[PDB]
C-alpha cells in the first residue's frame, strides 16, 4: 500500500502550470508510458495504472535533470 500521490501533490512537484509544466507532463508522460494529460487526467491516470511514488518520483528526477 500507499499514500495516493493527490492533485496537490501535483501542483507541488511543478507539473500544473503554464508552459513548463505542460512540457514536463508530456515528458514525464512518455517516460511513464501513460501518454500526455492534462493535470486532472494525469492524477487519474497515476492512479488507474497504480503508478508508485518511487517510479513517479525517479521519473520526475530524470525529467527535471534534463532541464540542467
Not at 508510458?33 to 511514488?53: C, D, E, M, T
Amino acid at each position: 500500500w500507499e499514500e495516493e500521490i493527490t492533485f496537490a501533490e501535483l501542483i507541488e512537484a511543478g507539473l500544473v502550470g503554464g508552459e513548463m509544466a505542460r512540457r514536463r507532463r508530456q515528458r514525464l508522460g512518455e517516460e511513464l508510458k501513460i501518454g500526455y494529460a492534462n493535470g486532472r487526467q494525469f492524477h487519474k491516470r497515476l492512479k488507474v495504472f497504480r503508478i508508485s511514488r518511487d517510479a513517479f518520483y525517479a521519473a520526475l528526477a530524470q525529467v527535471m535533470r534534463e532541464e540542467a
